[PDB]
Design a protein around this ligand. Sequence first.
Ligand code: COA
Ligand code: COA
Ligand code: COA
Ligand code: COA
Ligand code: CL
Ligand code: CL
Ligand code: CL
Ligand code: CL
Ligand code: CL
Ligand code: CL
Ligand code: NH4
Ligand code: NH4
Ligand code: NH4
Ligand code: NH4
Lengths: 389, 389, 389, 389
Amino acid sequence: PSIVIASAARTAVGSFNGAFANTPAHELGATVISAVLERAGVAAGEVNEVILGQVLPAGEGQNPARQAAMKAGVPQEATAWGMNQLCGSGLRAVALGMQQIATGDASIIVAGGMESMSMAPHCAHLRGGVKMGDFKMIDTMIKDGLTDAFYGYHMGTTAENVAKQWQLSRDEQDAFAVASYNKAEAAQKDGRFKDEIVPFIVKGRKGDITVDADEEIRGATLDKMAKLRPAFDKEGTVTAGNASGLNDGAAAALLMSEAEASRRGIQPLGRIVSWATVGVDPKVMGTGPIPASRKALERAGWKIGDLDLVEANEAFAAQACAVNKDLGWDPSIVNVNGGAIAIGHPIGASGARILNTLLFEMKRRGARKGLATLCIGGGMGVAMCIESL
Amino acid sequence: PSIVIASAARTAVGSFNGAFANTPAHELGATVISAVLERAGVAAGEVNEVILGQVLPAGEGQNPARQAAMKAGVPQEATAWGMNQLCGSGLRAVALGMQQIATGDASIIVAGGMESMSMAPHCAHLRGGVKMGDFKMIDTMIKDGLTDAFYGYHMGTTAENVAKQWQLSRDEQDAFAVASYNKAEAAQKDGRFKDEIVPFIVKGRKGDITVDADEEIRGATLDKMAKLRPAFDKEGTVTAGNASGLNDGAAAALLMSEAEASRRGIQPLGRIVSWATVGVDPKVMGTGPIPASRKALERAGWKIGDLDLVEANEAFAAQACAVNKDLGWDPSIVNVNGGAIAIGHPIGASGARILNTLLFEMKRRGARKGLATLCIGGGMGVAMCIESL
Amino acid sequence: PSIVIASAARTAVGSFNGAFANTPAHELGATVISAVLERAGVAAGEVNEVILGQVLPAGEGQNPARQAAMKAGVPQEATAWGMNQLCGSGLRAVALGMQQIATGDASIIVAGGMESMSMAPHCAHLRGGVKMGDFKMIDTMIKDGLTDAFYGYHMGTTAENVAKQWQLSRDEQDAFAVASYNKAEAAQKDGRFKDEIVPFIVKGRKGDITVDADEEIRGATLDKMAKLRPAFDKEGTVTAGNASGLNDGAAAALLMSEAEASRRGIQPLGRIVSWATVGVDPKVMGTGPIPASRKALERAGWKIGDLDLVEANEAFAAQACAVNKDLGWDPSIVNVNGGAIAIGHPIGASGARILNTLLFEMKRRGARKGLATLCIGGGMGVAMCIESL
Amino acid sequence: PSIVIASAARTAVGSFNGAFANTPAHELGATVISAVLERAGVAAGEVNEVILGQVLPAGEGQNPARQAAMKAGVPQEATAWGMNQLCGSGLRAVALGMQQIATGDASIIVAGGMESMSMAPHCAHLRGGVKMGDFKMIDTMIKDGLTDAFYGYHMGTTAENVAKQWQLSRDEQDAFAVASYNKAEAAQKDGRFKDEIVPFIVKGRKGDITVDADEEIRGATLDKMAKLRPAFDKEGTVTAGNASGLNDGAAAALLMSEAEASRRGIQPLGRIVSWATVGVDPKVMGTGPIPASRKALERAGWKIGDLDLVEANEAFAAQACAVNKDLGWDPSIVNVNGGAIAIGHPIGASGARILNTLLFEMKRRGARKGLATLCIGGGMGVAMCIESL
Ligand SMILES: CC(C)(COP(=O)(O)OP(=O)(O)OC[C@H]1O[C@@H](n2cnc3c(N)ncnc32)[C@H](O)[C@@H]1OP(=O)(O)O)[C@@H](O)C(=O)NCCC(=O)NCCS
Ligand SMILES: CC(C)(COP(=O)(O)OP(=O)(O)OC[C@H]1O[C@@H](n2cnc3c(N)ncnc32)[C@H](O)[C@@H]1OP(=O)(O)O)[C@@H](O)C(=O)NCCC(=O)NCCS
Ligand SMILES: CC(C)(COP(=O)(O)OP(=O)(O)OC[C@H]1O[C@@H](n2cnc3c(N)ncnc32)[C@H](O)[C@@H]1OP(=O)(O)O)[C@@H](O)C(=O)NCCC(=O)NCCS
Ligand SMILES: CC(C)(COP(=O)(O)OP(=O)(O)OC[C@H]1O[C@@H](n2cnc3c(N)ncnc32)[C@H](O)[C@@H]1OP(=O)(O)O)[C@@H](O)C(=O)NCCC(=O)NCCS
Ligand SMILES: [Cl-]
Ligand SMILES: [Cl-]
Ligand SMILES: [Cl-]
Ligand SMILES: [Cl-]
Ligand SMILES: [Cl-]
Ligand SMILES: [Cl-]
Ligand SMILES: [N+]
Ligand SMILES: [N+]
Ligand SMILES: [N+]
Ligand SMILES: [N+]
């Protein structure tokens, strides 16, 4: 059997404490589920399962994936579950949903990711009780999302390790970040994000607000970016400018077999050809996409030169430069409409966000072979190959 | 391809704020991964992926599944991710790992679940700030694990709905709970839990303690059970005695193809024949196993009368009576060594705990066809069919 | 013995979460201590004791009164302590300092109050530990400052009881509030607050800001006041417009004997003639100033007609109207420069704030006999009689 | 005018998280107020004001002194306020009440202190909001009670400075502590504490408990004292044995003029002859009683040799040895029934606790001249001279 992506959608990527500062992740995920259903011409009553990746679900309630599926209109007879592979959760959920149809355990799968880093709470274990002295309230976003569990420092410190081993100057990282900002603003002004973005209605107290544009896409200049101070190492190279930010958003895609889409008269966005996930040293988790993309290309029977478009998530300017320089693919086909440095980085949703960007750009310019990949905290990477029609 | 379970292991189920009151969940899972590897004669360097279900990972760090795999000795090249389908997470992870080998994306999978409900913290969203007035610190165990997101009451109130619609008296629920307590002591005194339980060393400051026995198994009398007060509805029927408790523990299983085990000279515990997951109304989530077991039996081509052993998770005495009475299978083969009312109910790990109990129960008495099933919060159920040899 | 007030000073009354949103109370009090010393021509080495009233000292450290005296320059040989009689703390500290010199145990006393309601934290008793369930983080400002400990409702509900017993319509309360708002702008625009206000420099990270004007004086119109919703009772009459707000500030006064000021050639602002404090029913604590002012006038040998100026703190429009009609003094001499409804109500500092306003306004228009009074939560009141020169 | 102490009472000193682990301070104070009235034969309607020292009132509600007076039976017409001079609050309140009657502003005063260090909560300022990162929950007991606001270290570090400047060996501090432990047990077993202790009924959920004995008095030997670890400096001399602990309790005294007691036929416990308070360097606040006692004795016209009994609060073994060696008074009359090292140290109540012990021990052995004194954090001391009647 062969599994195709019939439709795809994503919300606008909101800034930290921005438009989605008080919107739970399951409400964002409910909109993308309803969107991919209307775009594919498939009713909610036909969905078998909903697989949504999410990294920071504390305080949101019992299984936010079920909450997003029910709110979207999926009937109670269907099932839904959440998964956590950190930054690759959004893309892995699509591969997992593809495996559901491959084994014959499902027919129609809605897979993607959702993350609301603004809604992440502060926690502390208090069952034993603090009889004396002070104690710390731990930020779940920093602890459970952005801190390496083995070495104790932020993910930005891992990018510093990649910067030293690959010898990437501060100017090369800033130049890469300004290039990502300019491609993202050019794509937004030309309306190349309108096809993938579904508008989200933020029910506020003083009237409702329609969010349909990524609010992190600003105008970056090389001089103001070079004046920023390093955010992690006191004498490092990774700053707030050349590193992705904290963001909210959701993205998903509707999966079915190629024979199913042909029977329904659906023109799919692409066929999932292969996928792969490999682990690396946690010290340099940014190098994850390098062996993961090679394994996916090997499973598909493709060479690196056969790729027409590439979406590599830009967690940091340092890790992105190293991935492009090791794999050696043409950078003019990698992130043609910008990356996470300018658009945003919702952890659980980034895997499906770049897949949304990849799918519509392949259809818009007639590409035949595409690949999406991300780096994962703890030393992992994930990649997937898509073929047109 | 055909997938077999080469080995299985589980830790002792600890009581709430008991032996594992300060032990993180990933430390429990690390012991089960090492156990299933040593029991099967498979080195850690051969593991491709580790899939562990977990419901309450807040405050534990980046991807506790990766932390458990690394501490067990699995090399960095392998991958690991967590999943959350509430109480069915432990069993669903085994089906997902089974799908990894079926699609050809892996060869050896360690799948299971881990949960430390004692380590669940209290949280509160504090980024926006509380300008005036009091606010609530939310227990993540109650909110994200035991409270229905749609109707707002505890999972025990759902058992009250099942008790009312099925008209299950308080005496019938207490008699079912006392029967489960007595079966657990008979199995424990006869040492029928020694094969599945792997001893866990709690490294303390005042010497190390060896935990190798389920700490929830006590002695229950019918009169002491009748004196208990209802724990959820002020005039209900579900009490602390006839309901499962809050517990810590972990369980896992080593997966490989049937041809792989034959090449390695391994005699597997059983072959995974089929599996299924179906959704129901959240009001009566305890009825989850009823359509899930029929769909799993239908996928395997089995009738209910063909089953030799059955492990049905006893979330509540009311919901367990309803599942046995609708499916109508012989209760003398269901939970032969007791259930969660006496052993414990670690949410993310119960799915693999009853699978461990089922597998070793099939090997000791030569059963041929078995089935394990659980109910899931939010209105879902999961089931799996296992065949000996 | 005869005690005189040689000098007095106060900071500008800041709004809740306003200019002093992050300024500790002892830093505000330290500037007022330096001011009353410099204005009276008395060195810091001559201060015997510092008495500062404060209601919300949680989280500020050991004895904030000692911190304010030390930072102001008072030597270590002198002593300092805090007291708490709620809203009357600022005025009671002046009477207590007067008693220190009267009994001969001191010669020079700096007495007043300081309060930073913006810096009040949220607290919770956690030594025993919360084994299960949610718990409340208690706002110390609401609990320890604004909630009646006997009946459990806010101080605004007490104003509702006083309004009902005196039959004060909502329009009569709104008209009284607009009268104080209009008087406050007349005094501020004419610079009648510059003599009492000492400028405070808010040392920030992005430059320093000089605060020298009450930021709560905004100006109320009769129509906009009538459109506001009741803030306490769902069908009441006390709203945010006709009720005082939450504020930060500090105020103090330098005390010495009449012979000492004559010996140093110092001209005091006024002589303390008498003082009194009486308790009332907590349900109607707003009626506190009625018996307290009569008891003070009785001790001084004065009639109500002998008073030239009166400063009665306007905690609420309802409680203030009842005091004016019961005592029956000329309203044209009561709060001639506005009240707490327009200026603000820092609880621990209000007692010295109205004393500061009274002293300088008596000098501005040549008044001879004045009286200041406040109402106290829990059912108390305090009053003091002052004679110029 | 001459002021006498007509009656006095105190509760048993409870251990940290002990018998009074859940008893608010105002409930402890309410029993002491009812006791001093019942012991003197004075109705509650004759009390003019209640002055109670308290250091940790966070979370207890509006003016805990008013709460204690109301529950004790004092009518609403009387007033009540709290004061805070740290460890000298209990004794300073007695001196303040003496000044109320001396100036003629009151006739009957109930003065003392109350403290419940077990009920002190953890707090944190959260109005501005924590937008990113971890934050600390501050222990109000350590921050607002036991940490010097100027140098940042615990009060125990201050005792190390006094021990070093006076060169007090570790053996001399332990020998002084065991001497107080042995003197305290002789008083308790001989029933010399029964007259001052008033029984307190702890109404609990599992039955009521009668507390009528200081639970901190344990058996101390020289060997076990030498085996303890230093509690502050990693290589210091102050340990948990030779330092006072955290405790709960309350104490008060009934004040009136000497002519008033003669008119009511009351036999007073003693006459307040003089009092004094002096400040010292915060690094060595334990030396506070040295200049404070000299200032009190000179005001009373007494020589050190004229004293018959002395109660010097033993905050630490180091600070007590320095005070006894500097003043040079006979140690056989100093703390004849033990000190705070064995009985306990409730901060707000210790000033009245040693006053209670001093008054009854002077009446028990016919002493003529006595003195009580304490050291205060931040560098202060307080002393009072008492003459028996
Ligand atoms: C990098 C990071 C620490 C930034 O934290 P931050 O400093 O609080 O973010 P800020 O928005 O406040 O940036 C601070 C400063 O940089 C400036 N700045 C930010 N982006 C800029 C840009 N693109 N161009 C120019 N200036 C910029 C801001 O204006 C601000 O200056 P100011 O405070 O004086 O106004 C945070 O975004 C982060 O942790 N990123 C990592 C995400 C991650 O790990 N993802 C997973 C990877 S696998
Ligand atoms: C039991 C529960 C309801 C909370 O009640 P609880 O008070 O914490 O239960 P506890 O054991 O701590 O104390 C309960 C009382 O019942 C008694 N009790 C418990 N089990 C008993 C038994 N088997 N026989 C006799 N008495 C028993 C306890 O000793 C205690 O008596 P006590 O008041 O004298 O100490 C909690 O375990 C729960 O929420 N369970 C449901 C979670 C769930 O739904 N899991 C599945 C998810 S689908
Ligand atoms: C603090 C208090 C102002 C709370 O009100 P709040 O709504 O939470 O805070 P705000 O004042 O900012 O909101 C007031 C609203 O009325 C408006 N308002 C306030 N004063 C106004 C005035 N004088 N004229 C016209 N409109 C006014 C405000 O702009 C605001 O409108 P908004 O909804 O658009 O923001 C007040 O109700 C209170 O509780 N005071 C207690 C003080 C006290 O008890 N002291 C002890 C006395 S013994
Ligand atoms: C000294 C202090 C740090 C103790 O902290 P602590 O760790 O809770 O001390 P604990 O009593 O709980 O435990 C001390 C140990 O020594 C033992 N011990 C204590 N006192 C002892 C004694 N007098 N004789 C023999 N053994 C003793 C205890 O049993 C305990 O045994 P453990 O090792 O099994 O725990 C604390 O009480 C303190 O800060 N005191 C100073 C308060 C203060 O400032 N007072 C002056 C105000 S100006
Ligand atoms: Cl800018
Ligand atoms: Cl001058
Ligand atoms: Cl003097
Ligand atoms: Cl000035
Ligand atoms: Cl009088
Ligand atoms: Cl008694
Ligand atoms: N950025
Ligand atoms: N139970
Ligand atoms: N106001
Ligand atoms: N002690």
